[PDB]
Ligand binder design. Structure first.
Ligand code: NA
Length: 121
């Protein structure tokens, strides 16, 4: 149908906007602490601690398969990155401190993206 295509055109535009958002969020991680999943070879007990791991590469695979239906789903995944890190790592570590910084710097990007998604529909 023509409806299904128009729907698909909007998913594709949401995907374009979220791609730009993802890039902007990932620039706030210049150390690449959150680039890739936590290694199970190097942290073998990780899944005893964290039940839903998340990272920027895994968000990128979902993004390019148009797997985010809305911004809420995308933000849930970004918060997992941050929240997992703040639980697994202690306060006085470079990892926890990197999460805090990504959260604070990410918030501004996310604020405007919500406006843009609401505004453009
Ligand atoms: Na902790």
């Amino acid at each position: 149908s023509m409806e299904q295509v128009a729907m698909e055109l909007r998913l594709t535009e949401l995907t374009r906007l979220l791609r730009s958002v993802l890039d902007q969020l990932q620039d706030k991680d210049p150390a690449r602490i959150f680039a890739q999943p936590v290694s199970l070879k190097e942290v073998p007990d990780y899944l005893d601690h964290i039940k839903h791991p998340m990272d920027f590469a895994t968000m990128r695979k979902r993004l390019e398969a148009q797997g985010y239906k809305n911004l809420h789903e995308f933000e849930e995944d970004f918060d997992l990155i941050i929240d997992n890190c703040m639980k697994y790592n202690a306060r006085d570590t470079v990892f926890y401190r990197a999460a805090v910084r990504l959260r604070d710097q990410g918030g501004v990007v996310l604020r405007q993206a919500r406006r843009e998604v609401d505004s453009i529909g």
